[PDB]
Amino acid sequence: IDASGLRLGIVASTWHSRICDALLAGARKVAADSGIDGPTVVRVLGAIEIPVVVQELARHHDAVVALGVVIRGDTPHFDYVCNSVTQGLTRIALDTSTPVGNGVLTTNTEKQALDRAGLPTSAEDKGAQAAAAALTTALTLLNLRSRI
Amino acid sequence: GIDASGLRLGIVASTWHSRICDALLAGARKVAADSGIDGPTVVRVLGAIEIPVVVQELARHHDAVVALGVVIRGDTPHFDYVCNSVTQGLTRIALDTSTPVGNGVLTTNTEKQALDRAGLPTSAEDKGAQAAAAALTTALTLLNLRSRI
Amino acid sequence: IDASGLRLGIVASTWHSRICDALLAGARKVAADSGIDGPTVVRVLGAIEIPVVVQELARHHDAVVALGVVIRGDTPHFDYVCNSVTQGLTRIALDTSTPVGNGVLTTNTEKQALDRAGLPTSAEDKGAQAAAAALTTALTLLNLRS
Amino acid sequence: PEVPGIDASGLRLGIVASTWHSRICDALLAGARKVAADSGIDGPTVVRVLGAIEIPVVVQELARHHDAVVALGVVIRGDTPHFDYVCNSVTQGLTRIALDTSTPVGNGVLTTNTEKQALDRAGLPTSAEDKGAQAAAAALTTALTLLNLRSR
Amino acid sequence: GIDASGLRLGIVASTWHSRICDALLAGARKVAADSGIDGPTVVRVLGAIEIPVVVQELARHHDAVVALGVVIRGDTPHFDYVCNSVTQGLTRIALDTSTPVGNGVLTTNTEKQALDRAGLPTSAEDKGAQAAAAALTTALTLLNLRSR
Ligand code: NA
Ligand code: NA
Ligand code: NA
Ligand code: NA
Ligand code: NA
Numbered sequence: 210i211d212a213s214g215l216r217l218g219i220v221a222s223t224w225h226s227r228i229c230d231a232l233l234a235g236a237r238k239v240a241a242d243s244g245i246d247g248p249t250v251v252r253v254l255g256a257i258e259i260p261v262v263v264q265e266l267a268r269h270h271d272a273v274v275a276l277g278v279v280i281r282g283d284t285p286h287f288d289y290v291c292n293s294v295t296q297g298l299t300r301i302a303l304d305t306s307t308p309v310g311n312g313v314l315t316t317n318t319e320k321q322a323l324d325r326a327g328l329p330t331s332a333e334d335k336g337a338q339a340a341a342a343a344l345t346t347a348l349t350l351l352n353l354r355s356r357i
Numbered sequence: 358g359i360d361a362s363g364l365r366l367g368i369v370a371s372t373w374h375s376r377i378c379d380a381l382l383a384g385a386r387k388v389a390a391d392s393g394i395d396g397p398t399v400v401r402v403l404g405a406i407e408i409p410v411v412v413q414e415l416a417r418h419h420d421a422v423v424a425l426g427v428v429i430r431g432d433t434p435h436f437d438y439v440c441n442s443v444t445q446g447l448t449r450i451a452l453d454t455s456t457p458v459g460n461g462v463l464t465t466n467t468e469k470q471a472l473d474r475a476g477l478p479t480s481a482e483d484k485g486a487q488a489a490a491a492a493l494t495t496a497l498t499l500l501n502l503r504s505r506i
Numbered sequence: 507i508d509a510s511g512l513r514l515g516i517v518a519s520t521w522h523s524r525i526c527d528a529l530l531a532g533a534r535k536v537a538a539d540s541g542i543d544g545p546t547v548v549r550v551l552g553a554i555e556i557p558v559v560v561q562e563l564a565r566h567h568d569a570v571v572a573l574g575v576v577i578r579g580d581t582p583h584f585d586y587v588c589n590s591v592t593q594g595l596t597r598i599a600l601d602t603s604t605p606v607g608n609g610v611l612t613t614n615t616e617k618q619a620l621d622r623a624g625l626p627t628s629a630e631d632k633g634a635q636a637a638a639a640a641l642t643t644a645l646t647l648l649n650l651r652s
Numbered sequence: 653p654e655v656p657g658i659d660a661s662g663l664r665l666g667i668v669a670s671t672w673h674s675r676i677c678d679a680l681l682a683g684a685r686k687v688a689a690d691s692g693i694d695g696p697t698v699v700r701v702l703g704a705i706e707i708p709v710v711v712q713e714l715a716r717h718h719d720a721v722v723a724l725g726v727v728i729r730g731d732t733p734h735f736d737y738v739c740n741s742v743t744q745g746l747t748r749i750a751l752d753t754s755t756p757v758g759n760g761v762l763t764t765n766t767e768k769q770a771l772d773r774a775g776l777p778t779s780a781e782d783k784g785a786q787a788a789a790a791a792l793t794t795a796l797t798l799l800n801l802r803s804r
Numbered sequence: 805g806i807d808a809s810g811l812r813l814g815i816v817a818s819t820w821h822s823r824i825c826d827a828l829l830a831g832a833r834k835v836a837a838d839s840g841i842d843g844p845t846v847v848r849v850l851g852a853i854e855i856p857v858v859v860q861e862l863a864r865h866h867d868a869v870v871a872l873g874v875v876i877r878g879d880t881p882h883f884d885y886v887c888n889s890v891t892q893g894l895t896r897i898a899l900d901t902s903t904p905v906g907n908g909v910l911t912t913n914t915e916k917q918a919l920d921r922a923g924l925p926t927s928a929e930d931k932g933a934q935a936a937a938a939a940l941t942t943a944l945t946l947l948n949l950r951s952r
């Protein structure tokens with residue numbers, strides 16, 4: 210990914226610190242690997258707080274990465290939180306015509322979330338995937354706009 | 358320690374299951390007071406359905422809003438459609454108004470679950486406190502972001 | 507509740523008249539007991555039709571009450587109607603900054619809906635609850651905005 | 653019981669029917685058309701689309717220049733989750749349009765688990781229900797109601 | 805019996821699960837070509853989540869857009885929120901821009917199910933072709949409705 214021009218925002222929640230930090234770390238790695246060593250990084254408490262800050266960043270950034278973890282608890286809370294946050298991320302991308310890379314984990318168990326958080330032992334790095342998605346899409350959009 | 362003395366906070370709390378709602382509200386006030394806000398705008402409504410229009414009304418004139426209430430599953434699918442609509446209303450408003458909305462609306466299957474989350478002396482969790490900490494920390498973050506432009 | 511100064515709209519479906527008529531009657535009684543003797547009352551056939559009428563009422567009233575019933579049938583239709591209507595009522599309340607009391611029942615059985623329609627044998631009066639909801643919240647907003 | 657019909661002769665009506673599962677779609681359209689004629693509208697604007705996913709955008713086009721729109725079609729659950737997401741988004745979409753355009757949208761989009769359920773709701777000679785008829789009634793009655801309110 | 809020669813067609817296709825994505829795109833291309841459109845605008849993105857923002861970009865300057873891709877259920881609820889939110893986004897865009905968006909985003913439980921709907925030699929269905937047909941035929945309908 211050659212992403213040197215671009216302004217990247219990263220919004221990462223903090224609930225389940227270890228997972229969130231590792232999501233952040235993976236997002237940062239891909240950004241750095243793509244020419245962006247200093248993305249705008251912001252932290253929030255939980256996933257619920259992510260949309261409003263992703264919105265704030267999207268208005269002044271070419272791309273934003275949304276990072277966090279929701280693990281199902283005892284109640285239906287999980288279902289309404291995951292649906293609303295994910296749909297909020299879709300809205301902001303459309304409203305602002307800016308890609309929002311979705312690295313917000315929605316898992317039934319902790320081990321699932323750990324297995325996707327880009328730790329040494331993880332099957333996947335969702336932080337990295339979200340960053341690649343945000344950046345690659347922003348480049349494509351910049352290419353489309355720079356025509357006619 | 359959150360220092361929010363500069364900020365205007367609205368709190369809307371439903372009244373359906375008053376023991377729980379009152380405890381959610383008490384947990385929110387405490388965080389606010391502990392954060393330097395002794396006098397937030399507090400408004401009561403009947404049930405969860407009523408919360409969003411008032412959250413909007415408050416979000417327009419406040420830096421942060423906390424939405425508190427409880428919906429407990431009964432016999433019918435009513436639970437599902439209320440929880441989903443209210444929750445998405447709270448998301449819509451925060452985005453429309455670029456104002457954090459702390460979600461302390463409990464959506465439980467049983468009453469014991471709600472009580473266990475209401476920040477009563479016996480409760481596992483204090484959802485009103487978490488929803489106030491969420492809203493205030495987010496508003497200070499937004500404030501910081503906007504002071505850079 | 508003193509709501510004398512407030513303009514109130516009520517939209518009630520007519521599908522399943524035992525249920526719908528009883529919901530409307532419970533809402534009317536709250537409105538009357540709150541000092542609103544002449545609310546704008548509008549009937550529609552089914553629940554799907556309630557949103558566009560609620561929207562129309564909300565634009566010229568201080569509160570609106572939505573009443574009807576969706577009972578689950580054989581197909582997923584129930585799920586998509588209840589969700590879409592319910593979310594529509596939320597949209598309208600927000601768009602118009604006017605409360606919309608939700609008295610649209612969404613039940614699995616007809617017996618559940620009867621038991622919520624505020625007939626003399628009913629455990630609950632959801633028309634009454636929807637009306638108190640809309641009117642108390644309207645007074646609250648009035649107060650806030652003053 | 654005999655009850656006089658809706659008089660909607662002063663109204664402009666649009667009808668959009670999809671085509672997937674065409675004998676069912678055609679039957680919905682015919683039931684809707686019957687009710688429109690009975691109500692005084694022999695020439696509604698009738699438009700056909702491929703599937704239910706195509707219904708919203710056309711319903712919107714019609715809603716801008718008509719007093720009522722009828723939305724007709726069929727989704728039958730298949731193998732995959734596609735049914736759920738399609739049904740939800742289409743139904744949501746019809747709700748959004750009615751609000752955006754303050755114009756009623758009569759919902760005759762069947763969303764069934766089986767073909768037999770759809771057939772039984774499509775107003776065929778042998779059908780239990782005529783959801784096309786129902787959807788046309790809803791849109792037209794609601795439209796007259798709105799006109800009545802707007803005179804106030 | 806689709807004559808869209810005079811129409812502007814945009815196609816967005818994700819990349820995740822290449823074989824299927826590529827076949828979906830070949831299916832839509834073939835339909836466009838047969839309908840008189842030999843140079844559609846074709847954009848590639850990483851995954852389903854990235855489809856709507858690009859579909860929006862194209863819908864603003866095209867008479868029709870085709871959205872193509874595949875989401876296959878894995879271990880967590882991620883599938884349900886991505887599917888609901890993408891499908892809802894495509895519906896939103898079509899309405900916002902009054903421009904048809906053909907939906908060729910597969911949402912499946914299994915890989916075999918996706919492969920069976922991707923328009924491969926032995927596939928039961930050609931969802932790319934179906935999405936292109938949908939978008940183009942609806943585009944013509946709107947053109948007629950607007951004509952006088
Ligand atoms: Na931007
Ligand atoms: Na504000
Ligand atoms: Na009003
Ligand atoms: Na109209
Ligand atoms: Na366009």
